[PDB]
Design a binder for this molecule. Structure first.
Ligand SMILES: [Mn+2]
Length: 269
């Protein structure tokens, strides 16, 4: 079977309970994770240890809080007490864990299921070929020995309109924002990096990135996390918003792909 779970945010207990709910068996089943494995929740260390131990039985994409952890670790950015990342940063095996984490993809594609995964989704301004190229570039930087220079370069809210002519730092910033931070779009598909509310309560003319016809979403189903205020509701057919806000007191949501069956684990705090 194939299982997809949204943003875990250090919620190790809920993750293990939900996987036992569905009898997840490595070797016979596959797990897809929308990223943001760490922060806010109490068990970032345990979550990373376990996901890493799964080996090929998991398909992960990195989110913004994974990148932020990578940036704190490399001394690029400062530790926020609210993240609760200190046990993980101080662990004896922290090197193994984060060096593994930075090698993971931004994008997962399964051709047989016609299924795509990224932390925040796929901008309507990208076709599949372009999304693949951009994922490759950023993953190459992230897995290189010079990853802290990229992590430092990544912070930024511009440019927010994709063009194949973007070069250098602008191109990297836009890729990273599209994959890990995107929420609302302007009618031309340009990213808005400020609105974080639900679609009903957003200002005009902002529209959810998935409310805009794009080449990828016309041929593929898209699963994603990141946008908790969405609450997993109100998406069009073929769009799966799996982030139900576990670390915030919501739920951890798991979707079994074969029959599209949902399983939900209540938040412990
Ligand atoms: Mn999130």
């Amino acid at each position: 079977a194939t299982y997809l779970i949204g943003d875990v945010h250090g919620c190790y207990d809920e993750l293990i309970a939900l996987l036992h709910k569905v009898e997840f068996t490595p070797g016979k089943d596959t797990l897809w994770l929308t990223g943001a494995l760490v922060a806010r929740g109490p068990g970032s260390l345990d979550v990373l240890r376990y996901v890493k131990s799964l080996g090929d039985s998991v398909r992960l994409v990195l989110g913004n809080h994974d990148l932020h952890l990578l940036a704190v670790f490399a001394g690029i950015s400062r530790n926020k007490p609210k993240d609760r990342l200190t046990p993980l940063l101080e662990a004896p095996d922290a090197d193994e864990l984060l060096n593994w984490l930075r090698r993971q993809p931004l994008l997962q594609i399964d051709e047989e299921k016609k299924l795509v995964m990224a932390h925040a989704g796929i901008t309507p301004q990208w076709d599949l070929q372009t999304a693949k190229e951009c994922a490759r570039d950023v993953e190459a930087v992230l897995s290189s020995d010079s990853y802290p220079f990229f992590l430092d370069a990544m912070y930024g809210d511009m440019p927010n309109n994709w063009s194949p002519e973007l070069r250098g730092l602008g191109r990297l910033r836009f890729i990273t924002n599209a994959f890990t931070r995107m929420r609302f779009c302007f009618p031309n598909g340009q990213l808005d990096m400020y609105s974080k509310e639900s679609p009903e309560e957003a200002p005009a003319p902002l529209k959810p990135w998935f409310a805009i016809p794009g080449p990828v979403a016309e041929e593929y189903s898209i699963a994603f996390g990141h946008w908790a205020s969405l609450e997993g509701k109100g998406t069009p057919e073929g769009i799966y918003a799996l982030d139900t806000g576990c670390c915030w007191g919501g739920t951890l949501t798991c979707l079994r792909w074969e029959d599209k069956q949902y399983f939900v684990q209540p938040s412990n705090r």
